[PDB]
RNA sequence: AAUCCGGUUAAUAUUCCGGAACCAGAAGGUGGAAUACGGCAACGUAAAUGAAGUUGGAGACGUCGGCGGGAGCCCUGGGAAGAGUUCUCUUUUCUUUUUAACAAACCAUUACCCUGACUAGGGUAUGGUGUUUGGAAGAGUUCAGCGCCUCAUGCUGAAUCCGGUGCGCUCUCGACGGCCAAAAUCCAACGGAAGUUUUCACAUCUGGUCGUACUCUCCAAGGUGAACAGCCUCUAGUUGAUAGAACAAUGUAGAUAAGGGAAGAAUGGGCCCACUGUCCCUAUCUACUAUCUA
């Protein structure tokens, strides 16, 4: 569990094959937590801006497994 | 007849003692066939069997 | 400040307790600082319509105390079996039947 | 050397499940630097050659007492929920109210260095002890509601909060005062033989054998009582050891008994005084045994 605050790094992390799946959890505070599980660490990025979260979801790599809120 | 293995099981899912259970005296038929933990979990949600709250300190 | 709402629509419909009876019981049993009717300006009890009672208090007003006060009337009316006080929402208390 | 959580059985969990990490070892690959650094200083960084030979630290250390730091239990206030009490009084009474492993930044009771000739001014390290976040609410717990011939056992809402206290109890760490193991294993230094660098980061893999069920020195609530004496309750666990039935003598045992008070309980006290069924003189009661029935 290593939270990441760099959007570009998260996109680069998704670009590399180290990422396995990405889960976007909708919290009560209306902040989208983009949690991506890698081989050695869990990458979680919390974005309060819905448009930024929507842009991040749209820009996510096609190979990544996008998951809704569990 | 012998409810021993069924009440003792119920207390285990009841997380309290074996004497901390209670049922009415006229439903012995439908409890006797409940053998697994899933059967008991169905029964506790029904409320036919139930604990009792603690009485004072 | 804080607003406490007690729903009496079910009681009015079932005629278990009237709105005036609830208001009279509330007025006669409002032990503000241990004194009945001592609500003053800090706490104002204004039941809007004959279906609910609203209390606006500038100080702390315990919902349990209101529920405890409401339980006395139900015990006096012997309607506890057929009517129970429930917490519909934070600061909202309602009466539920069996 | 290195793992925790939640859930799961008729009987299993740090092993199983779901989720999340850590360790060791292994190669090559990528990128980064490489052809080490600044400060008078303690010391610090992403890396930053080291043969033979030499040295050290840890492992690896006696006992007791007090103090500080923290945690938990217990105690207690407020909020929420539920239940109980009530014409009367009681915002009452009782129950519950969670955040691991590890991963990111924050912070000394102590010692060292600089100025100073102890006091005093600037840094230095351990940060067990916390200042948020991920994990992590999606989990769990408690209420309210619904789904329905049905193994439908799900579904919907919420809350799961703000605190405080310690001659308490337990443990832990730390600054003092005294009273007086070894081996396994790991790290570093000196050293200067040799003429791309790995102790930087990221990606990759795998991790054998055996015990593991079950029955019995450790775990140990509160109150009342001065007290670990004694009781009570809570937690939890039993109602099991052949019974029934009646109550004479006998025997055990516990008591009470007029008047006298060693003629055979008193509080015990200072031969004396007091005391008493030891005795005169035994009487009565209760319980058990005895007795019957199976």
Swiss-Prot record, chain A:
The keyword Cell membrane does not apply. Its main location: cytoplasm. GO terms for cellular component: cytosol; cytosolic large ribosomal subunit; preribosome. Keywords: Cytoplasm, Ribonucleoprotein, Ribosomal protein. Pfam families: Ribosomal_L38e (PF01781). Component of the ribosome, a large ribonucleoprotein complex responsible for the synthesis of proteins in the cell. The small ribosomal subunit (SSU) binds messenger RNAs (mRNAs) and translates the encoded message by selecting cognate aminoacyl-transfer RNA (tRNA) molecules. The large subunit (LSU) contains the ribosomal catalytic site termed the peptidyl transferase center (PTC), which catalyzes the formation of peptide bonds, thereby polymerizing the amino acids delivered by tRNAs into a polypeptide chain. This is Large ribosomal subunit protein eL38A. It comes from Schizosaccharomyces pombe (strain 972 / ATCC 24843) (Fission yeast). The lineage of its organism: Eukaryota, Fungi, Dikarya, Ascomycota, Taphrinomycotina.
Curated annotation (Swiss-Prot), chain B:
It comes from the Eukaryota. Disulfide bonds: none annotated. It is found in: Cytoplasm. Component of the ribosome, a large ribonucleoprotein complex responsible for the synthesis of proteins in the cell. The small ribosomal subunit (SSU) binds messenger RNAs (mRNAs) and translates the encoded message by selecting cognate aminoacyl-transfer RNA (tRNA) molecules. The large subunit (LSU) contains the ribosomal catalytic site termed the peptidyl transferase center (PTC), which catalyzes the formation of peptide bonds, thereby polymerizing the amino acids delivered by tRNAs into a polypeptide chain. There are 2 genes for eL19 in S.pombe. Belongs to the eukaryotic ribosomal protein eL19 family. Component of the large ribosomal subunit (LSU). Mature yeast ribosomes consist of a small (40S) and a large (60S) subunit. The 40S small subunit contains 1 molecule of ribosomal RNA (18S rRNA) and at least 33 different proteins. The large 60S subunit contains 3 rRNA molecules (25S, 5.8S and 5S rRNA) and at least 46 different proteins. eL19 lies in close proximity to the binding site for eukaryotic initiation factor eIF4G. This is Large ribosomal subunit protein eL19A. It comes from Schizosaccharomyces pombe (strain 972 / ATCC 24843). The gene is rpl1901.
From Swiss-Prot, chain C:
Keywords: Cytoplasm, Nucleus, Phosphoprotein, Ribonucleoprotein, Ribosomal protein. One of its GO terms (biological process) is cytoplasmic translation. The modification Phosphoserine is found at residues 41-42. The keyword Transport does not apply. One of its GO terms (cellular component) is nucleolus. One of its GO terms (molecular function) is structural constituent of ribosome. It is found in: Cytoplasm; Nucleus, Nucleolus. Transmembrane segments: none annotated. Component of the large ribosomal subunit (LSU). Mature yeast ribosomes consist of a small (40S) and a large (60S) subunit. The 40S small subunit contains 1 molecule of ribosomal RNA (18S rRNA) and at least 33 different proteins. The large 60S subunit contains 3 rRNA molecules (25S, 5.8S and 5S rRNA) and at least 46 different proteins. Belongs to the eukaryotic ribosomal protein eL22 family. Component of the ribosome, a large ribonucleoprotein complex responsible for the synthesis of proteins in the cell. The small ribosomal subunit (SSU) binds messenger RNAs (mRNAs) and translates the encoded message by selecting cognate aminoacyl-transfer RNA (tRNA) molecules. The large subunit (LSU) contains the ribosomal catalytic site termed the peptidyl transferase center (PTC), which catalyzes the formation of peptide bonds, thereby polymerizing the amino acids delivered by tRNAs into a polypeptide chain. This is Large ribosomal subunit protein eL22. The lineage of its organism: Eukaryota, Fungi, Dikarya, Ascomycota, Taphrinomycotina. The gene is rpl22.
